[PDB]
Amino acid sequence: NPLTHSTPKNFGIGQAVQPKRNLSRYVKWPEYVRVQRQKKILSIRLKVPPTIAQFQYTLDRNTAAETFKLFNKYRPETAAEKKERLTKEAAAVAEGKSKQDASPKPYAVKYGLNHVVALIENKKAKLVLIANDVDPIELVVFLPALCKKMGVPYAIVKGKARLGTLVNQKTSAVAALTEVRAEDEAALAKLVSTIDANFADKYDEVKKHWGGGILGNKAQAKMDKRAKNSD
Amino acid sequence: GRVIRNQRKGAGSIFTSHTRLRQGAAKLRTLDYAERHGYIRGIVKQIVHDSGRGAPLAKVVFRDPYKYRLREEIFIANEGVHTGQFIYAGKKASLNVGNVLPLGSVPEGTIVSNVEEKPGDRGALARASGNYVIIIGHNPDENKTRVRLPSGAKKVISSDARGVIGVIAGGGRVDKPLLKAGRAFHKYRLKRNSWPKTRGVAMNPVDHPHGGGNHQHIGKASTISRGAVSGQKAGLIAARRTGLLRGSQKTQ
Amino acid sequence: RPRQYATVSKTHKTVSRAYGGSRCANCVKERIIRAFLIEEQKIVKKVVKEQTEAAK
Amino acid sequence: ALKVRTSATFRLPKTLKLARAPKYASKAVPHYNRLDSYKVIEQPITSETAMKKVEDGNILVFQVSMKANKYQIKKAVKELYEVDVLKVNTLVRPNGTKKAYVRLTADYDALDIANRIGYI
RNA sequence: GAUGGGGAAGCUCCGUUUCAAAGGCCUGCAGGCCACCAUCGAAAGGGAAUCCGGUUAAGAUUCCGGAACCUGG
RNA sequence: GCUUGUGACGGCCCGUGAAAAUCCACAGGAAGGAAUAGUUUUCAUGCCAGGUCGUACUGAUAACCGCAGCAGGUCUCCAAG
RNA sequence: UUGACAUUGUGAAGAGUUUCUUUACUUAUUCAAUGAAGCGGAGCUGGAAUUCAUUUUCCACGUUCUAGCAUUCAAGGUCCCAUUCGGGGCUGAUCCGGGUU
């Protein structure tokens, strides 16, 4: 209107002083940031053997949520719960009913790495969950082939932090249950079928295939050009 | 024996450069989006004698494109430039004296000065008085232009490397004798402590290989192999020949 | 001397123009002229570009 | 899911920078006022040259601790003698002791103050 | 010549726009801008500002009398 | 006239013959701003303070160094007929 | 200084089961600059092609007489808020990969 006046700016070369912009691309980041990003990328390079290419097949979110829902039923105890049980079973059985028969048998996930490992060794395990994102990874590389040879159902999953939360811990790296009540065995089998199909049965094939090989945006598009524009 | 003169110069203490009266080092800009795509104009505000160096300098200003300021830069004079002149610079820049361009942006037979050996080295070659460097051909394969150098040589470098049109000012400095020790003295105090110079054959054997006497003479050949040792290397070095010669091609 | 320019009032340090104690009158005149004439020739370059581009 | 950083230069982002929460009160107690007034002003100087300045110039000459300074000197005088201090000049005698020539205001007679002090 | 760092068995060495997350500027926080930034290094370099007269055995552009100037608040 | 400072000039160079703190100005136009009044302290005037250290004497054919009160050596200003 | 071994990975091509020659790559390593500013990819846009215009093969990307000036998330336009005075968002300044180059 007739007091405001529309005066654009060129923002062009040799004139029209340049504005501010999103320079997140051209950042000179800190060292640790560059390190984690470049480690990720380098790991993406350098063709990965099948023994690690097992990983990065984690799950569908739907099956993930279903499984987690199952596992939440078989939580461990907490401070107050262990406190209560130990007050009561003691108070009764110590001068009363049988030692530790004065309180119910428990059910839970039976977490803990070496515990899990021994259970699998003893075939006493029923289902296994393996966080994909461990560091170091030799902790866990040997579990899938192990469970395969032992005929046990496993899956690789996401969020070792989620595993931790499942135990009221920061992280677990593992979670693998046996004790299941009769009510949940149907869902147990339901998940087992699809999961062995997805992970366990495909083991021997994935064990054949490598990973990596990727280029990255620039050289990748460049190879696409050197192939398409030239062939 | 002792340590010889030239063995000692690596440590500097005496033999460093006398850079008080220097202006800032003379250089091109930092390469950037403008020169990379388009051009930019700068203005020479004044040109000046730097000391301990012929080939006078020019202080040039540009608009900081990315911020409200001025960026001053120290270019090497180009034999005709002058105050108040506009100095265009970049890929799309005009082909005139003083302007600075890549090499693919110009033809062969053209010449240039202060040229970059690599993009963003900010000037390596043809930085001396009355010198210059020639373009002789291009090769868009790998963006490689080829050139001829004041040593008579030839080279190949990136065609995108920047260089300033013309030849460097100063010119016939060498054609004037010094006539005497003192002008040389001043000429060299403004640079370094590399002068006067004593002759090895006058020195003593401990102070030099040549050294000892009863007669000012050397004793053995003064062509000291390229595979020799520091402290042995005094005289002629990789002598592919020696004595006076004719003639004469630099390279062809 | 420099630190006395802080003590003294401003009539000692400036004359009554734009670019008072910074530039001489003939340079300011020059710079005024340069501004006006170039902004006119700028307009002229603009309209010349328009009639030329709309020529075809 | 992103963020805008409008400059390639990153810096340490600020934080709270806590205050100190001492448990055990590092010093068992505070010192007293080391360098009080009595400690500051040590001794008058009754050399005849000094008595002359007294009689004539309304000055007191005092030997003082090196650790003092003119503010403290003045402060201590005005307290210990209930006086107005015009000015002071100071020095270090070659024997390693500090001297102060303390001029008084016109209201006070340095001499009468001297014999009040009991030196004269 | 410290620091980040990097060498050296190490005493310590290299380097001082350092391959660094290197802060303080205004108007508890909200606004805002702005940063290769230790520190030392000249009693003859640079640099805010004072003079006269008089005074002592011995001090003085320092003291006394008089008259100024500069900074900071 | 002597010393000394100073200015504008002229000659010299392949020699063109410090830096920083500090101070100022300019552009800029962020902002705030008068009527019973409101703005300004780079005008004048007014008020308080201005710390620490050194400060004497010699500076040489007797105070420095030369083992010493050594004809030696040791930076410099003033400069009458 | 030269050779071997290790760092030292991935592809191809092939003379005499060989194990030797160049040449392919970026992540290793190496070099350089920058307050790590504008890489890359498709674009758009624009000219200039055509047609009773529409891609229907064409093409390229805003500053050059002059010792000026270019700064306040930018003016404009478009939305919200009620907007008393002032804020806030999108464009203006194509979008997408975050390989600083």
Side-chain angles (χ1 to χ4, degrees), chain B residues 36-37 39 63 66 68 84 86 94:
Chain B
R36 206 156 47 221
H37 308 310
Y39 67 82
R63 278 153 85 267
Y66 301 65
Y68 182 31
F86 299 114
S94 59

PDB file of all heavy atoms in Angstrom, chain B residues 36-37 39 63 66 68 84 86 94, chain G residues 37-39 63-64 67-68 70:
ATOM      1  N   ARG B  36      34.149 -19.280  -8.205  1.00  0.00           N
ATOM      2  CA  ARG B  36      33.881 -20.623  -8.667  1.00  0.00           C
ATOM      3  C   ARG B  36      32.803 -20.655  -9.732  1.00  0.00           C
ATOM      4  O   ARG B  36      32.842 -21.528 -10.604  1.00  0.00           O
ATOM      5  CB  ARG B  36      33.470 -21.463  -7.469  1.00  0.00           C
ATOM      6  CG  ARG B  36      33.723 -22.926  -7.582  1.00  0.00           C
ATOM      7  CD  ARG B  36      33.842 -23.523  -6.207  1.00  0.00           C
ATOM      8  NE  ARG B  36      32.757 -23.055  -5.353  1.00  0.00           N
ATOM      9  CZ  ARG B  36      32.866 -22.697  -4.079  1.00  0.00           C
ATOM     10  NH1 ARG B  36      34.020 -22.720  -3.430  1.00  0.00           N
ATOM     11  NH2 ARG B  36      31.773 -22.414  -3.407  1.00  0.00           N
ATOM     12  N   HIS B  37      31.847 -19.727  -9.675  1.00  0.00           N
ATOM     13  CA  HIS B  37      30.782 -19.634 -10.667  1.00  0.00           C
ATOM     14  C   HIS B  37      30.867 -18.347 -11.467  1.00  0.00           C
ATOM     15  O   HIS B  37      30.910 -18.393 -12.699  1.00  0.00           O
ATOM     16  CB  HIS B  37      29.425 -19.721  -9.984  1.00  0.00           C
ATOM     17  CG  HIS B  37      29.289 -20.899  -9.084  1.00  0.00           C
ATOM     18  ND1 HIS B  37      29.603 -22.180  -9.479  1.00  0.00           N
ATOM     19  CD2 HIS B  37      28.883 -20.988  -7.800  1.00  0.00           C
ATOM     20  CE1 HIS B  37      29.388 -23.010  -8.475  1.00  0.00           C
ATOM     21  NE2 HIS B  37      28.948 -22.311  -7.444  1.00  0.00           N
ATOM     22  N   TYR B  39      31.939 -13.852 -11.009  1.00  0.00           N
ATOM     23  CA  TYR B  39      33.068 -12.976 -10.799  1.00  0.00           C
ATOM     24  C   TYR B  39      32.811 -12.068  -9.618  1.00  0.00           C
ATOM     25  O   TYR B  39      31.727 -12.040  -9.039  1.00  0.00           O
ATOM     26  CB  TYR B  39      33.376 -12.142 -12.044  1.00  0.00           C
ATOM     27  CG  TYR B  39      32.337 -11.119 -12.442  1.00  0.00           C
ATOM     28  CD1 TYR B  39      32.281  -9.873 -11.842  1.00  0.00           C
ATOM     29  CD2 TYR B  39      31.448 -11.383 -13.458  1.00  0.00           C
ATOM     30  CE1 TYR B  39      31.348  -8.943 -12.216  1.00  0.00           C
ATOM     31  CE2 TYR B  39      30.514 -10.453 -13.843  1.00  0.00           C
ATOM     32  CZ  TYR B  39      30.468  -9.236 -13.216  1.00  0.00           C
ATOM     33  OH  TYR B  39      29.545  -8.300 -13.595  1.00  0.00           O
ATOM     34  N   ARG B  63      34.219  -6.428  -1.245  1.00  0.00           N
ATOM     35  CA  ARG B  63      33.081  -6.565  -0.366  1.00  0.00           C
ATOM     36  C   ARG B  63      33.047  -7.977   0.182  1.00  0.00           C
ATOM     37  O   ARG B  63      33.041  -8.948  -0.577  1.00  0.00           O
ATOM     38  CB  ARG B  63      31.787  -6.275  -1.117  1.00  0.00           C
ATOM     39  CG  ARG B  63      31.487  -4.823  -1.245  1.00  0.00           C
ATOM     40  CD  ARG B  63      30.646  -4.505  -2.460  1.00  0.00           C
ATOM     41  NE  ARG B  63      29.218  -4.670  -2.226  1.00  0.00           N
ATOM     42  CZ  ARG B  63      28.511  -5.770  -2.461  1.00  0.00           C
ATOM     43  NH1 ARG B  63      29.082  -6.878  -2.904  1.00  0.00           N
ATOM     44  NH2 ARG B  63      27.208  -5.757  -2.225  1.00  0.00           N
ATOM     45  N   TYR B  66      29.554 -12.265   2.554  1.00  0.00           N
ATOM     46  CA  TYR B  66      28.865 -12.983   3.604  1.00  0.00           C
ATOM     47  C   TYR B  66      28.664 -12.142   4.854  1.00  0.00           C
ATOM     48  O   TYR B  66      28.084 -12.631   5.826  1.00  0.00           O
ATOM     49  CB  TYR B  66      29.646 -14.246   3.963  1.00  0.00           C
ATOM     50  CG  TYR B  66      29.876 -15.253   2.851  1.00  0.00           C
ATOM     51  CD1 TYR B  66      30.658 -14.956   1.749  1.00  0.00           C
ATOM     52  CD2 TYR B  66      29.360 -16.528   2.942  1.00  0.00           C
ATOM     53  CE1 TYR B  66      30.877 -15.881   0.757  1.00  0.00           C
ATOM     54  CE2 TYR B  66      29.578 -17.457   1.958  1.00  0.00           C
ATOM     55  CZ  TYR B  66      30.338 -17.132   0.868  1.00  0.00           C
ATOM     56  OH  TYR B  66      30.552 -18.068  -0.114  1.00  0.00           O
ATOM     57  N   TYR B  68      28.833  -7.693   6.400  1.00  0.00           N
ATOM     58  CA  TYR B  68      29.020  -6.287   6.089  1.00  0.00           C
ATOM     59  C   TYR B  68      30.406  -5.870   6.526  1.00  0.00           C
ATOM     60  O   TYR B  68      30.595  -5.408   7.652  1.00  0.00           O
ATOM     61  CB  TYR B  68      27.970  -5.426   6.779  1.00  0.00           C
ATOM     62  CG  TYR B  68      28.047  -3.949   6.476  1.00  0.00           C
ATOM     63  CD1 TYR B  68      28.496  -3.479   5.260  1.00  0.00           C
ATOM     64  CD2 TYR B  68      27.649  -3.027   7.413  1.00  0.00           C
ATOM     65  CE1 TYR B  68      28.543  -2.136   4.997  1.00  0.00           C
ATOM     66  CE2 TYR B  68      27.685  -1.690   7.161  1.00  0.00           C
ATOM     67  CZ  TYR B  68      28.137  -1.245   5.954  1.00  0.00           C
ATOM     68  OH  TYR B  68      28.174   0.099   5.695  1.00  0.00           O
ATOM     69  N   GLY B  84      42.530   3.411  -8.023  1.00  0.00           N
ATOM     70  CA  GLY B  84      41.175   3.641  -8.445  1.00  0.00           C
ATOM     71  C   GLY B  84      40.673   2.681  -9.493  1.00  0.00           C
ATOM     72  O   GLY B  84      39.549   2.851  -9.978  1.00  0.00           O
ATOM     73  N   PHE B  86      39.332  -0.875 -11.134  1.00  0.00           N
ATOM     74  CA  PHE B  86      38.449  -1.958 -10.751  1.00  0.00           C
ATOM     75  C   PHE B  86      39.045  -3.264 -11.222  1.00  0.00           C
ATOM     76  O   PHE B  86      39.538  -3.357 -12.350  1.00  0.00           O
ATOM     77  CB  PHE B  86      37.067  -1.770 -11.343  1.00  0.00           C
ATOM     78  CG  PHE B  86      36.405  -0.535 -10.890  1.00  0.00           C
ATOM     79  CD1 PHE B  86      36.144   0.483 -11.769  1.00  0.00           C
ATOM     80  CD2 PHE B  86      36.058  -0.385  -9.577  1.00  0.00           C
ATOM     81  CE1 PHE B  86      35.540   1.631 -11.341  1.00  0.00           C
ATOM     82  CE2 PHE B  86      35.460   0.752  -9.139  1.00  0.00           C
ATOM     83  CZ  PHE B  86      35.196   1.766 -10.020  1.00  0.00           C
ATOM     84  N   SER B  94      36.099 -10.933 -16.927  1.00  0.00           N
ATOM     85  CA  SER B  94      36.576 -10.438 -18.204  1.00  0.00           C
ATOM     86  C   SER B  94      38.076 -10.644 -18.334  1.00  0.00           C
ATOM     87  O   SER B  94      38.803 -10.738 -17.344  1.00  0.00           O
ATOM     88  CB  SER B  94      36.239  -8.961 -18.365  1.00  0.00           C
ATOM     89  OG  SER B  94      36.810  -8.187 -17.330  1.00  0.00           O
TER      90      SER B  94
ATOM     91  P     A G  37      34.254 -22.046   5.520  1.00  0.00           P
ATOM     92  OP1   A G  37      35.473 -21.915   4.689  1.00  0.00           O
ATOM     93  OP2   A G  37      34.087 -21.246   6.755  1.00  0.00           O
ATOM     94  O5'   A G  37      33.017 -21.729   4.587  1.00  0.00           O
ATOM     95  C5'   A G  37      31.712 -22.146   4.943  1.00  0.00           C
ATOM     96  C4'   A G  37      30.936 -22.628   3.751  1.00  0.00           C
ATOM     97  O4'   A G  37      29.563 -22.172   3.882  1.00  0.00           O
ATOM     98  C3'   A G  37      31.403 -22.079   2.417  1.00  0.00           C
ATOM     99  O3'   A G  37      30.950 -22.956   1.395  1.00  0.00           O
ATOM    100  C2'   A G  37      30.638 -20.776   2.355  1.00  0.00           C
ATOM    101  O2'   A G  37      30.581 -20.176   1.084  1.00  0.00           O
ATOM    102  C1'   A G  37      29.283 -21.239   2.852  1.00  0.00           C
ATOM    103  N9    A G  37      28.448 -20.184   3.405  1.00  0.00           N
ATOM    104  C8    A G  37      28.674 -19.444   4.522  1.00  0.00           C
ATOM    105  N7    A G  37      27.734 -18.579   4.777  1.00  0.00           N
ATOM    106  C5    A G  37      26.836 -18.774   3.745  1.00  0.00           C
ATOM    107  C6    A G  37      25.621 -18.173   3.427  1.00  0.00           C
ATOM    108  N6    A G  37      25.079 -17.201   4.149  1.00  0.00           N
ATOM    109  N1    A G  37      24.969 -18.601   2.334  1.00  0.00           N
ATOM    110  C2    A G  37      25.510 -19.576   1.605  1.00  0.00           C
ATOM    111  N3    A G  37      26.647 -20.221   1.802  1.00  0.00           N
ATOM    112  C4    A G  37      27.257 -19.766   2.899  1.00  0.00           C
ATOM    113  P     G G  38      31.554 -22.865  -0.083  1.00  0.00           P
ATOM    114  OP1   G G  38      32.575 -23.925  -0.245  1.00  0.00           O
ATOM    115  OP2   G G  38      31.916 -21.451  -0.332  1.00  0.00           O
ATOM    116  O5'   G G  38      30.316 -23.230  -1.010  1.00  0.00           O
ATOM    117  C5'   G G  38      29.647 -24.469  -0.851  1.00  0.00           C
ATOM    118  C4'   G G  38      28.179 -24.362  -1.150  1.00  0.00           C
ATOM    119  O4'   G G  38      27.553 -23.419  -0.240  1.00  0.00           O
ATOM    120  C3'   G G  38      27.826 -23.834  -2.521  1.00  0.00           C
ATOM    121  O3'   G G  38      27.918 -24.810  -3.539  1.00  0.00           O
ATOM    122  C2'   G G  38      26.432 -23.289  -2.302  1.00  0.00           C
ATOM    123  O2'   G G  38      25.480 -24.332  -2.200  1.00  0.00           O
ATOM    124  C1'   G G  38      26.607 -22.645  -0.942  1.00  0.00           C
ATOM    125  N9    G G  38      27.168 -21.303  -1.081  1.00  0.00           N
ATOM    126  C8    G G  38      28.408 -20.934  -0.682  1.00  0.00           C
ATOM    127  N7    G G  38      28.681 -19.690  -0.924  1.00  0.00           N
ATOM    128  C5    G G  38      27.535 -19.229  -1.539  1.00  0.00           C
ATOM    129  C6    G G  38      27.233 -17.955  -2.044  1.00  0.00           C
ATOM    130  O6    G G  38      27.939 -16.946  -2.043  1.00  0.00           O
ATOM    131  N1    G G  38      25.965 -17.927  -2.593  1.00  0.00           N
ATOM    132  C2    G G  38      25.104 -18.983  -2.644  1.00  0.00           C
ATOM    133  N2    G G  38      23.929 -18.734  -3.211  1.00  0.00           N
ATOM    134  N3    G G  38      25.367 -20.182  -2.181  1.00  0.00           N
ATOM    135  C4    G G  38      26.593 -20.217  -1.648  1.00  0.00           C
ATOM    136  P     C G  39      29.070 -24.720  -4.654  1.00  0.00           P
ATOM    137  OP1   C G  39      30.014 -23.612  -4.393  1.00  0.00           O
ATOM    138  OP2   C G  39      28.392 -24.782  -5.967  1.00  0.00           O
ATOM    139  O5'   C G  39      29.884 -26.069  -4.458  1.00  0.00           O
ATOM    140  C5'   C G  39      29.603 -27.178  -5.284  1.00  0.00           C
ATOM    141  C4'   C G  39      30.000 -28.484  -4.657  1.00  0.00           C
ATOM    142  O4'   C G  39      29.627 -28.500  -3.261  1.00  0.00           O
ATOM    143  C3'   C G  39      29.314 -29.692  -5.261  1.00  0.00           C
ATOM    144  O3'   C G  39      30.012 -30.174  -6.388  1.00  0.00           O
ATOM    145  C2'   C G  39      29.256 -30.678  -4.113  1.00  0.00           C
ATOM    146  O2'   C G  39      30.491 -31.359  -3.980  1.00  0.00           O
ATOM    147  C1'   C G  39      29.088 -29.752  -2.914  1.00  0.00           C
ATOM    148  N1    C G  39      27.685 -29.550  -2.470  1.00  0.00           N
ATOM    149  C2    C G  39      26.810 -30.597  -2.132  1.00  0.00           C
ATOM    150  O2    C G  39      27.156 -31.773  -2.279  1.00  0.00           O
ATOM    151  N3    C G  39      25.555 -30.291  -1.718  1.00  0.00           N
ATOM    152  C4    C G  39      25.182 -29.031  -1.574  1.00  0.00           C
ATOM    153  N4    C G  39      23.958 -28.733  -1.157  1.00  0.00           N
ATOM    154  C5    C G  39      26.050 -27.968  -1.874  1.00  0.00           C
ATOM    155  C6    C G  39      27.268 -28.261  -2.293  1.00  0.00           C
ATOM    156  P     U G  63      23.408  -9.626 -15.042  1.00  0.00           P
ATOM    157  OP1   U G  63      22.834  -8.458 -15.748  1.00  0.00           O
ATOM    158  OP2   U G  63      24.207 -10.625 -15.793  1.00  0.00           O
ATOM    159  O5'   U G  63      24.318  -9.078 -13.862  1.00  0.00           O
ATOM    160  C5'   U G  63      23.827  -8.069 -13.002  1.00  0.00           C
ATOM    161  C4'   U G  63      24.926  -7.377 -12.235  1.00  0.00           C
ATOM    162  O4'   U G  63      25.374  -8.200 -11.129  1.00  0.00           O
ATOM    163  C3'   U G  63      26.206  -7.058 -12.990  1.00  0.00           C
ATOM    164  O3'   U G  63      26.096  -5.922 -13.828  1.00  0.00           O
ATOM    165  C2'   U G  63      27.201  -6.869 -11.860  1.00  0.00           C
ATOM    166  O2'   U G  63      27.076  -5.579 -11.290  1.00  0.00           O
ATOM    167  C1'   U G  63      26.723  -7.905 -10.848  1.00  0.00           C
ATOM    168  N1    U G  63      27.528  -9.139 -10.880  1.00  0.00           N
ATOM    169  C2    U G  63      27.316 -10.109 -11.824  1.00  0.00           C
ATOM    170  O2    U G  63      26.419 -10.077 -12.639  1.00  0.00           O
ATOM    171  N3    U G  63      28.163 -11.181 -11.737  1.00  0.00           N
ATOM    172  C4    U G  63      29.203 -11.356 -10.859  1.00  0.00           C
ATOM    173  O4    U G  63      29.880 -12.379 -10.926  1.00  0.00           O
ATOM    174  C5    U G  63      29.376 -10.287  -9.939  1.00  0.00           C
ATOM    175  C6    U G  63      28.562  -9.240 -10.005  1.00  0.00           C
ATOM    176  P     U G  64      26.934  -5.836 -15.198  1.00  0.00           P
ATOM    177  OP1   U G  64      26.498  -4.608 -15.905  1.00  0.00           O
ATOM    178  OP2   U G  64      26.856  -7.145 -15.889  1.00  0.00           O
ATOM    179  O5'   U G  64      28.442  -5.613 -14.736  1.00  0.00           O
ATOM    180  C5'   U G  64      28.857  -4.370 -14.180  1.00  0.00           C
ATOM    181  C4'   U G  64      29.926  -3.703 -15.011  1.00  0.00           C
ATOM    182  O4'   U G  64      31.208  -4.356 -14.791  1.00  0.00           O
ATOM    183  C3'   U G  64      29.691  -3.733 -16.520  1.00  0.00           C
ATOM    184  O3'   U G  64      30.125  -2.511 -17.103  1.00  0.00           O
ATOM    185  C2'   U G  64      30.616  -4.851 -16.979  1.00  0.00           C
ATOM    186  O2'   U G  64      31.025  -4.777 -18.325  1.00  0.00           O
ATOM    187  C1'   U G  64      31.785  -4.655 -16.041  1.00  0.00           C
ATOM    188  N1    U G  64      32.645  -5.832 -15.923  1.00  0.00           N
ATOM    189  C2    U G  64      33.810  -5.863 -16.658  1.00  0.00           C
ATOM    190  O2    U G  64      34.177  -4.960 -17.387  1.00  0.00           O
ATOM    191  N3    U G  64      34.553  -6.997 -16.503  1.00  0.00           N
ATOM    192  C4    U G  64      34.249  -8.081 -15.722  1.00  0.00           C
ATOM    193  O4    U G  64      35.027  -9.030 -15.684  1.00  0.00           O
ATOM    194  C5    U G  64      33.025  -7.974 -14.998  1.00  0.00           C
ATOM    195  C6    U G  64      32.278  -6.876 -15.127  1.00  0.00           C
ATOM    196  P     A G  67      37.156   6.565 -11.630  1.00  0.00           P
ATOM    197  OP1   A G  67      37.403   8.025 -11.637  1.00  0.00           O
ATOM    198  OP2   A G  67      38.144   5.635 -12.226  1.00  0.00           O
ATOM    199  O5'   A G  67      36.929   6.124 -10.120  1.00  0.00           O
ATOM    200  C5'   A G  67      36.657   4.767  -9.812  1.00  0.00           C
ATOM    201  C4'   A G  67      37.053   4.397  -8.409  1.00  0.00           C
ATOM    202  O4'   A G  67      38.454   4.714  -8.209  1.00  0.00           O
ATOM    203  C3'   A G  67      36.293   5.118  -7.299  1.00  0.00           C
ATOM    204  O3'   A G  67      36.095   4.233  -6.205  1.00  0.00           O
ATOM    205  C2'   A G  67      37.257   6.216  -6.888  1.00  0.00           C
ATOM    206  O2'   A G  67      37.072   6.682  -5.572  1.00  0.00           O
ATOM    207  C1'   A G  67      38.592   5.509  -7.053  1.00  0.00           C
ATOM    208  N9    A G  67      39.738   6.397  -7.222  1.00  0.00           N
ATOM    209  C8    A G  67      39.874   7.456  -8.071  1.00  0.00           C
ATOM    210  N7    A G  67      41.027   8.062  -7.988  1.00  0.00           N
ATOM    211  C5    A G  67      41.690   7.344  -7.014  1.00  0.00           C
ATOM    212  C6    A G  67      42.963   7.477  -6.462  1.00  0.00           C
ATOM    213  N6    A G  67      43.810   8.429  -6.835  1.00  0.00           N
ATOM    214  N1    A G  67      43.336   6.605  -5.509  1.00  0.00           N
ATOM    215  C2    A G  67      42.466   5.660  -5.145  1.00  0.00           C
ATOM    216  N3    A G  67      41.239   5.431  -5.591  1.00  0.00           N
ATOM    217  C4    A G  67      40.911   6.320  -6.533  1.00  0.00           C
ATOM    218  P     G G  68      34.722   3.425  -6.081  1.00  0.00           P
ATOM    219  OP1   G G  68      34.867   2.474  -4.955  1.00  0.00           O
ATOM    220  OP2   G G  68      34.343   2.931  -7.418  1.00  0.00           O
ATOM    221  O5'   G G  68      33.659   4.543  -5.699  1.00  0.00           O
ATOM    222  C5'   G G  68      33.443   4.889  -4.347  1.00  0.00           C
ATOM    223  C4'   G G  68      32.109   5.547  -4.148  1.00  0.00           C
ATOM    224  O4'   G G  68      31.341   5.553  -5.368  1.00  0.00           O
ATOM    225  C3'   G G  68      31.193   4.869  -3.156  1.00  0.00           C
ATOM    226  O3'   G G  68      31.573   5.113  -1.818  1.00  0.00           O
ATOM    227  C2'   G G  68      29.834   5.437  -3.527  1.00  0.00           C
ATOM    228  O2'   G G  68      29.642   6.705  -2.935  1.00  0.00           O
ATOM    229  C1'   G G  68      29.972   5.621  -5.045  1.00  0.00           C
ATOM    230  N9    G G  68      29.230   4.632  -5.840  1.00  0.00           N
ATOM    231  C8    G G  68      29.707   3.863  -6.859  1.00  0.00           C
ATOM    232  N7    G G  68      28.802   3.103  -7.403  1.00  0.00           N
ATOM    233  C5    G G  68      27.651   3.412  -6.705  1.00  0.00           C
ATOM    234  C6    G G  68      26.337   2.912  -6.824  1.00  0.00           C
ATOM    235  O6    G G  68      25.902   2.064  -7.604  1.00  0.00           O
ATOM    236  N1    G G  68      25.485   3.497  -5.901  1.00  0.00           N
ATOM    237  C2    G G  68      25.851   4.444  -4.986  1.00  0.00           C
ATOM    238  N2    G G  68      24.902   4.901  -4.174  1.00  0.00           N
ATOM    239  N3    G G  68      27.067   4.914  -4.860  1.00  0.00           N
ATOM    240  C4    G G  68      27.902   4.355  -5.745  1.00  0.00           C
ATOM    241  P     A G  70      28.385   0.682   2.234  1.00  0.00           P
ATOM    242  OP1   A G  70      28.599   0.821   3.692  1.00  0.00           O
ATOM    243  OP2   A G  70      29.504   0.237   1.372  1.00  0.00           O
ATOM    244  O5'   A G  70      27.165  -0.310   2.007  1.00  0.00           O
ATOM    245  C5'   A G  70      25.902  -0.021   2.583  1.00  0.00           C
ATOM    246  C4'   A G  70      24.775  -0.676   1.835  1.00  0.00           C
ATOM    247  O4'   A G  70      25.059  -0.613   0.417  1.00  0.00           O
ATOM    248  C3'   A G  70      24.579  -2.146   2.150  1.00  0.00           C
ATOM    249  O3'   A G  70      23.215  -2.503   1.952  1.00  0.00           O
ATOM    250  C2'   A G  70      25.441  -2.817   1.101  1.00  0.00           C
ATOM    251  O2'   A G  70      25.102  -4.157   0.835  1.00  0.00           O
ATOM    252  C1'   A G  70      25.192  -1.920  -0.097  1.00  0.00           C
ATOM    253  N9    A G  70      26.281  -1.919  -1.061  1.00  0.00           N
ATOM    254  C8    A G  70      27.519  -1.372  -0.911  1.00  0.00           C
ATOM    255  N7    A G  70      28.287  -1.526  -1.954  1.00  0.00           N
ATOM    256  C5    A G  70      27.480  -2.218  -2.839  1.00  0.00           C
ATOM    257  C6    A G  70      27.713  -2.707  -4.122  1.00  0.00           C
ATOM    258  N6    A G  70      28.879  -2.537  -4.735  1.00  0.00           N
ATOM    259  N1    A G  70      26.715  -3.375  -4.736  1.00  0.00           N
ATOM    260  C2    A G  70      25.560  -3.538  -4.082  1.00  0.00           C
ATOM    261  N3    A G  70      25.225  -3.133  -2.867  1.00  0.00           N
ATOM    262  C4    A G  70      26.246  -2.477  -2.301  1.00  0.00           C
TER     263        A G  70
END
